[PDB]
Amino acid sequence: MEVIELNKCTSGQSFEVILKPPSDPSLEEIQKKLEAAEERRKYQEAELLKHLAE
């Protein structure tokens, strides 16, 4: 119904049509979590080489 903010130019045009009105983690923890998971691997890798050593 109501066409507003009609903007035109050579490339085209744009507008708005209303039909009815209404009614972060720091680098601190990133590299901490990445390394806390890395030695969860190392621990698992160690228990394997321990198991294999047995």
Binding site: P21, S26, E38
Partner: protein, 437 residues
């Protein structure tokens, strides 16, 4: 002018980036060697296309893009592709062994040994920027790289570039095209970890693109090439307002403003019409009313769901080709009396319309026919949560038996992250339900 950097992560992201940049070049009259005859400001400029391309003294127009894969073979086909001279080596980054469709491996294990490098190569692009708006991130939900390394990157970018906006182009997993079985795990994990770091995300369900390729292009079994050229058309529609002169969605900030009223619910549904076969001998060109009417047909959506059984929060109509405001307003008026379009009470029931007179460009030898007028609707409907429900259910089935979980835990991940990610998704499903009913 303000620059945008496109980051393509994993196989899906890379090959889709290829499709987009190929298409961009054709739309801007840039050739494979990077020469752009129509650009009369040799060596630099302030134009709208400079949002996505920088310029060298030699007159080359190079994408503001970075490609990253944890494994070479996909990006190698960019190093030797028809647009090899378009990019330069520092833009293309490759690991040696991929993430094996394992989020944990892509995020934690292999992600760690390459994250600092990528950010550096990204920083080398941002130093060439006078005013960076932010980033467009292309990736798959199901890939280990596409899911795991992306969430890692998205976390750092919010740290190294806090004030910059970040949009996503996300490939939602489909069994007909996929081969991994653990993609639901990867999808939930990466969504949980990226949600607070993504301002606006456009989900594309491979299932939807696949059926569109069969139904409307008469391709019996679509290839990634078939899917990606169609996806690039949609993406091109969504980014045209950043690369061309206009007054709608001129920067990334406006995408969130116009489409994302509430931050967590930042997944707008895209719908595109018309899709016409090039091998179709005889075709009747469709009108503004017909293509606008096709925007409320589920069979044209990037994600199959039912907007009738949800509520809208925003709705943009982006036209390309022979279109004038008068025809649009008539088409809108007609459709409304015939279709079910419920907005949330705290939103005006209206449409933001963008028109570019240049009709959509097609790749020569592609599957798509040239049309006189096309349209992409961006609607933030709560119905898209059906896609979350599907995904969350598949996740629940496997996780109840802890199936495949050991693959992730074996890479240092804790089983608790699974339940955390799933609870965040359970919250997200309820956010949608509060708003939608």
């Amino acid at each position: 002018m303000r620059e945008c950097i496109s980051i393509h992560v994993g196989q899906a992201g890379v090959q889709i980036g290829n499709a987009c940049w190929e298409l961009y070049c054709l739309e801007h009259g840039i050739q494979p060697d990077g020469q752009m005859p129509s650009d009369k400001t040799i060596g630099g400029g302030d134009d709208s296309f400079n949002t996505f391309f920088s310029e060298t003294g030699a007159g080359k127009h190079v994408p503001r893009a970075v490609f990253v894969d944890l494994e070479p073979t996909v990006i190698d086909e960019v190093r030797t592709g028809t647009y090899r001279q378009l990019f330069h080596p520092e833009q293309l980054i490759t690991g040696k062994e991929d993430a094996a469709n394992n989020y944990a491996r892509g995020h934690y294990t292999i992600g760690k040994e390459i994250i600092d490098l990528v950010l550096d190569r990204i920083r080398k692009l941002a130093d060439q920027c006078t005013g960076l708006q932010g980033f467009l991130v292309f990736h798959s939900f199901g890939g280990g790289t596409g899911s795991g390394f992306t969430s890692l990157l998205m976390e750092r970018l919010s740290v190294d570039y806090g004030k910059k906006s970040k949009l996503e182009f996300s490939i939602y997993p489909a069994p007909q095209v996929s081969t991994a079985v653990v993609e639901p795990y990867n999808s939930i994990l990466t969504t949980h970890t990226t949600l607070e770091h993504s301002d606006c995300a456009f989900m594309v369900d491979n299932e939807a693109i696949y059926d569109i390729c069969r139904r409307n292009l008469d391709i019996e079994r679509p290839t990634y090439t078939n899917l990606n050229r169609l996806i690039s058309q949609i993406v091109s529609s969504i980014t045209a307002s950043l690369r061309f002169d206009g007054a709608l969605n001129v920067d990334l900030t406006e995408f969130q403003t116009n489409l994302v009223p509430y931050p967590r619910i930042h997944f707008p549904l895209a719908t595109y019409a018309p899709v016409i076969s090039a091998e179709k001998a005889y075709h009747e060109q469709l009108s503004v009313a017909e293509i606008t009417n096709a925007c409320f047909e589920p069979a044209n959506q990037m994600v199959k769901c039912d907007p009738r059984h949800g509520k809208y929060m925003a709705c943009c109509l982006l036209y390309r080709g022979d279109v004038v405001p008068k025809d649009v307003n008539a088409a809108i008026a007609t459709i409304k009396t015939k279709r079910s379009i419920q907005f949330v009470d705290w939103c005006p029931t209206g449409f933001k319309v963008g028109i570019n007179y240049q009709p959509p460009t097609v790749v020569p030898g592609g599957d798509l026919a040239k049309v006189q007028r096309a349209v992409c609707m961006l609607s933030n409907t709560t119905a898209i949560a059906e896609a979350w429900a599907r995904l969350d259910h598949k996740f629940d089935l496997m996780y109840a038996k802890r199936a495949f979980v050991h693959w992730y835990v074996g890479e240092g991940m804790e089983e608790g992250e699974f339940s955390e990610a799933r609870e965040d998704m359970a919250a997200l499903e309820k956010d949608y339900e509060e708003v939608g009913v």
